[PDB]
Amino acid sequence: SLSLVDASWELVDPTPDLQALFVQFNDQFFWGQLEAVEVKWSVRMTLCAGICSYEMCSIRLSEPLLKLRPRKDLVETLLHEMIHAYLFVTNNDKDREGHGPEFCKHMHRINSLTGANITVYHTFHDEVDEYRRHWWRCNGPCQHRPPYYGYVKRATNREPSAHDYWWAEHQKTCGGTYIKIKE
Template sequence: MDEDLTVALRLQEEWDARAAKRAARETLSLVDPSWELLDPNPNLQGLFVQFNDCFFWGRLGAVEVKWSPRMTLCAGICSYEGRGGMCSIRISEPLLKFRPRKDLVETLLHEMIHAYLFITNNDKDREGHGPEFCKHMHRINRLTGANITVHHTFHSEVEEYRRHWWRCNGPCQHKQPYYGYVKRATNRAPSAHDSWWAEHQKACGGTYIKIKEPENYSKKGKGKTKQPVSTVENKGTFTHTLLSFL
């Protein structure tokens, strides 16, 4: 009898502990600091499903969400291909792996608002952050304690990946704010493919010379033939990026 009572008490204690943990999870703000210990490496798909049910009335079931292992210049991106097309969210693994859990939560929610506006054909503001976006942003912030914003500034993480540097040898090397520098995460030299190139050629006319790259980068590239890069413009596709830099 005593043994049965001991077992029963132990089971009750375990049950009470689980119930307390569940209650804590349900009452915590989405960005409460304790989440960093309770769930420091959340499952992206799991968060998406949870947020879709709680904040978007289950309307985002057909939206694709994935980590992007190579996206280094923006924290999040949401793409939508026309009416009735595919809506896709990409979250930057390289940038957000350095950040607290709350930054992932707020970035994902930001992109989910864009997805919701896209698929409900309520994306009237083509700049992406008009009244409709702000309405949902403020609604979710009030409900969750999050601080979703129009823009996130992960400057230190972005800078960490910008290891290919060029500098112009013309007059612009003496002018603010860039002093002739162009820094990128990929080995893509400044060229006519850049929107600002024609203006630079007219105002400065200098030549960009590479001055810095990742250690041993040139050795790794030996023996490989680079394929030409082609760009295709799809006029039926609208893409929103949460954060981008030249």
């Protein structure tokens, strides 16, 4: 009934309709509460498959990473990001960890309803991600700025600094602090 899993789940969708999926999912899984959330494709984002940004809440999905993947990857990424958005909109985003019990409650619930496999972790380009595993996010306004949306992801444990050639502009236009979120 709310089941998402059929033969096509495993297959690429030539013509995904992101706005339609968002409207469907808001209705079917989030009690209509994500009406004011903006979801868009990003054509240059490659650092992440999906992100959120918070003022109003915005979701972006990577066209380069998702357009030719099976439709389960678009859907599971979108639902993952919508759970973050829901915790934001409902002022329930106070868990210490990125994906704490509150995230995981919705993940389990929607997986149960749909047969899907939303996860706390990413399920594609395993080797790229495995090595490029040190992640920071700026807690400043560049979070809304494409194509990085505040993220830095490195294969070594070296935090952003003045010896990055992109630093001066960042400090001048944004000025936020990079917070380490993954190792």
